[PDB]
Structure formats: structure tokens, C-alpha cells
Antibody
Framework: EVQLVESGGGLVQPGRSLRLSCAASGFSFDEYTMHWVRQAPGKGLEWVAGINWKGNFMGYADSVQGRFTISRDNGKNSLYLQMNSLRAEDTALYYC????????????????????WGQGTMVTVSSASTKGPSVFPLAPSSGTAALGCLVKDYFPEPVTVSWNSGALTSGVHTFPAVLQSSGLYSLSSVVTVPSSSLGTQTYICNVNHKPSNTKVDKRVEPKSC | EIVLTQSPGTLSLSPGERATLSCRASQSVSSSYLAWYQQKPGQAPRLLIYGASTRATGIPARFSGSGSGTDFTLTISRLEPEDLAVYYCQQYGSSPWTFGQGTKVEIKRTVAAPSVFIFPPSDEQLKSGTASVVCLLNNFYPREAKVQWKVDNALQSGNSQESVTEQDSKDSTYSLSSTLTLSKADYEKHKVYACEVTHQGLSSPVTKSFNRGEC
């Protein structure tokens, strides 16, 4: 089975460096032009750099010239991207991508369609410091009720939410995060339930924010008066 | 540089209907070197078409491409549910290779009015100076909805943000949250918090509300 697996992404301050790698298996890696293609959050795709099978012809997007370096190790079936002098605008999910064309050689960077892609590795360039979320209950009250958890003021993306350690999945909505004017992210996760269940059943949201190693379990129960 | 302009921004189509997606280039794309990709949320792009008209291996026959020069089209002859995605065109006739900005294909279904819920700030949040009030719209179609905040009957502006889910894979509906953010100081100053919802599936707007500190 064909695999491309990227790694090396993370949060870095502007001006600093990162090195991405893409490890390939399941095909003759040393016979193809390989590429990096990036996708800024909410945006479209942009070719970043490419390198021919032999690794002697390479090309770069204008925006990363002088800053990024693509290279390959055919013995390790691996592709790399050295990224120096990172800027906020370099923030993106970085995909490793295989060219469709088996190489015609004559030593050139060519091709231009990508038929196999990795899952991508996320790069965030910012002077903002990692910050874990505060988790607040969205309590139900008064035949369907709703409850939830507010996951507020964290950085950077992403945060994941489950309910009852994965046991509650139907009726759940975990919303896309929004960027607040503070520069921090916030989202809510909700679930609709039969009203009668409010007295009978326990609801706990499980919040994970990997960048800050923040794991929070918040029991959500009806409010009284 | 070759700029690719896709249209429309969004297509809404019932299953079985024809999807026609356009890609226009700012200069001639040499040798019809134009590709189309499908991208679903959380997933990497998938190559559908290359050379303007050639289906990639494994791609269903309902996908086809045509065109040359500056005008190209992707056609899905009869839309399947799983075709909900963003579609991107890409030229590789001239370097640097460039992509269009995408056309989103969403699935049309019958109108469904949202159920609406309102959440006051928790006492835990209140203990530290900020109050968030949340309005939830559940399981609705179409996407377009108006969600207005009223505080003691005064309509709010500029102090709320919305977030919308992707279309449900099961029932093709959306859900939406609107979040009103106030300081704890002015939160405690007011009594009646309401979200008013206007939607095609509602004969008149629906309001959910709570009275601060009450039950």
C-alpha cells in the first residue's frame, strides 16, 4: 500500500526554522518527481517546491525563494523541506505529494499533477505563545434538550472534543473554532438529548489540546434554582 | 502569472442532478495541461482529471472534463451524496503551477427549520470577568439563517461570532452557533438575553431567551 507520511510541523516564532520530512513507502520513490504543496487554513492550494527523481533539478515558489530548501534521500525514500526565516504567511498545512508522471529524465523539474498525497503536517508561525483552553459547561434547562462545553481562549489550533470518552457520538456537534480579536481561538461542542435523560444520564465532555498538553474532563449537568 | 478563476463559488444540487463547474484562465493553458482535484474536509486532495479531459485511474465515469485555451469545465453527470467536496482546478502548462480558489458543491435537500437553544454564561466563567452567551441552531437547511442578539430588547451589533458545521453526512443539514461576548460587568447589568432566529423553514422568527439570575 502506498504511504506518504509527513512530520516536523509545529508552532514557531517568526524568523525561526523548521525542517519537514516526508517518508514514503509502497512505490518506487526514487523514480518520481516529489513536491511540497501547502494549504493555509480556510484557503486553497499553493505549490511550494519540487525536486526531480535524481535530486539535481529543483524549483521553488517565488514566496519561499532564498528561505526554503527541498531535498531528497533516495536511500531512505524520504523528502525534506528546510524552512528558514519563517513568516506568519507561511502558516499552512504542508503536504508531501507525488507527481503522476513517471520520470522521462533528461534532468528537469517537470510534471505537475499530483496523484498521491500525504495527510500533511501543520506549520504555525506566530509570536503568540501556546495557551491551553478554559472549559466551561453549557448547561441545559427549561422533547429535546441541549447541552455543551465552551472551549475558550487557546492557541494554537487544534483542539479535539469527545463526549463520555467516545461513548456519546450521535447528536454531537463540535463547531469549527473561531479566531477572537484577542488572537486566541474558541469553540463549542454541543449535543442534543431527550429531555427525560437529563435526570437519568451523565454527560462529560473530554477536551484535548495537544500543543499545551491540556486534557480536561468537564461534567455537564442541569442548573438548579 | 496564470490566474485561474473558478465559478460558481458554491453549487447546491439534489442527488442525481448535473454539476457544471467552470475554470477560466488569465492566459492560454498550453497543451490543455489542466487538472481537477476533489477535496473533502479533513482530507487531502484527490486527482480526478488531467490533460483537461482524461479521467485519473479509479475515478467514476460520472466525472468528466472538457475545454482548452482559457476555458475549462468539470462535469458530474449525476451527483452522488459522496461528491460533496470542494473542487479545485490546476494548470501545469506554465510555471509556476497554479490552482483555482475552489468551487464548493453542497447537497440540496428539503427545507428543515432549526431547533433553537440558548445558554447563559456558567458561574465558573463569570468568576473571571468574561461572559459568553451561546445560541445553538440544530439540524437545519438551507444554510442561510439570520441570528440576532437582543439584550433587554436592544438589538446587538458587532459583538457576536458565528460558527457553522459542515453538512451532515447523514441528513445533509447544518448546525450553527452564535456566541455573544460581554464583560462580566455589563453582563450583570442586564436582565433579558435573547437570540432571534429567522429562517426559510420558520413561518415567523423564533426567539429563545433567559432572565439573568432567574429560573
Amino acid at each position: 500500500e502506498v504511504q506518504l507520511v509527513e512530520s516536523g510541523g509545529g508552532l514557531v516564532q517568526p524568523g525561526r526554522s523548521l525542517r519537514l520530512s516526508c517518508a514514503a513507502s509502497g512505490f518506487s520513490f526514487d523514480e518520481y518527481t516529489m513536491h511540497w504543496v501547502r494549504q493555509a487554513p480556510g484557503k486553497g492550494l499553493e505549490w511550494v517546491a519540487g525536486i526531480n527523481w535524481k535530486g539535481n533539478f529543483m524549483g521553488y515558489a517565488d514566496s519561499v525563494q532564498g528561505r526554503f530548501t527541498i531535498s531528497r534521500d533516495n536511500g531512505k525514500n524520504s523528502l525534506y523541506l528546510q524552512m528558514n526565516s519563517l513568516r506568519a504567511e507561511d502558516t499552512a498545512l504542508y503536504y508531501c505529494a507525488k507527481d503522476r508522471l513517471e520520470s522521462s529524465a533528461m534532468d528537469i523539474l517537470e510534471g505537475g499533477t499530483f496523484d498521491i498525497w500525504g495527510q500533511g503536517t501543520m506549520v504555525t508561525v506566530s509570536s503568540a505563545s501556546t495557551k491551553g483552553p478554559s472549559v466551561f459547561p453549557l448547561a441545559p434547562s427549561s422533547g429535546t434538550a441541549a447541552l455543551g462545553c465552551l472551549v475558550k481562549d487557546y492557541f494554537p489550533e487544534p483542539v479535539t472534543v469527545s463526549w463520555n470518552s467516545g461513548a456519546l457520538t450521535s447528536g454531537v456537534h463540535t463547531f469549527p473554532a473561531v479566531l477572537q480579536s484577542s488572537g486566541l481561538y474558541s469553540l463549542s461542542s454541543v449535543v442534543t438529548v431527550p429531555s427525560s435523560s437529563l435526570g437519568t444520564q451523565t454527560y462529560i465532555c473530554n477536551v484535548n489540546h495537544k500543543p499545551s498538553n491540556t486534557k480536561v474532563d468537564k461534567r455537564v449537568e442541569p442548573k438548579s434554582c | 502569472e496564470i490566474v485561474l478563476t473558478q465559478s460558481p463559488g458554491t453549487l447546491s444540487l439534489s442527488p442525481g442532478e448535473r454539476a457544471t463547474l467552470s475554470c477560466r484562465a488569465s492566459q492560454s493553458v498550453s497543451s490543455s495541461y489542466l487538472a481537477w482535484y476533489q477535496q473533502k474536509p479533513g482530507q487531502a486532495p484527490r486527482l480526478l482529471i488531467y490533460g483537461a479531459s482524461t479521467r485519473a485511474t479509479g475515478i467514476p465515469a460520472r466525472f468528466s472534463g472538457s475545454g482548452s485555451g482559457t476555458d475549462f469545465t468539470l462535469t458530474i453527470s449525476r451527483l452522488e451524496p459522496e461528491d460533496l467536496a470542494v473542487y479545485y482546478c490546476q494548470q501545469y502548462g506554465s510555471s509556476p503551477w497554479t490552482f483555482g480558489q475552489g468551487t464548493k458543491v453542497e447537497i440540496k435537500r428539503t427545507v428543515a427549520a432549526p431547533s433553537v437553544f440558548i445558554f447563559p454564561p456558567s458561574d465558573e466563567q463569570l468568576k473571571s470577568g468574561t461572559a459568553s452567551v451561546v445560541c445553538l441552531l440544530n439540524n437545519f437547511y438551507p444554510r442561510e439563517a439570520k441570528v440576532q442578539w437582543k439584550v433587554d430588547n436592544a438589538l446587538q451589533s458587532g459583538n457576536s461570532q458565528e460558527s457553522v458545521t459542515e453538512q451532515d453526512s447523514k441528513d445533509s443539514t447544518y448546525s450553527l452557533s452564535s456566541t455573544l461576548t460581554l464583560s462580566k460587568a455589563d453582563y450583570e447589568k442586564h436582565k433579558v438575553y435573547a437570540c432571534e432566529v429567522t429562517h426559510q423553514g420558520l413561518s415567523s422568527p423564533v426567539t429563545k431567551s433567559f432572565n439573568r439570575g432567574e429560573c
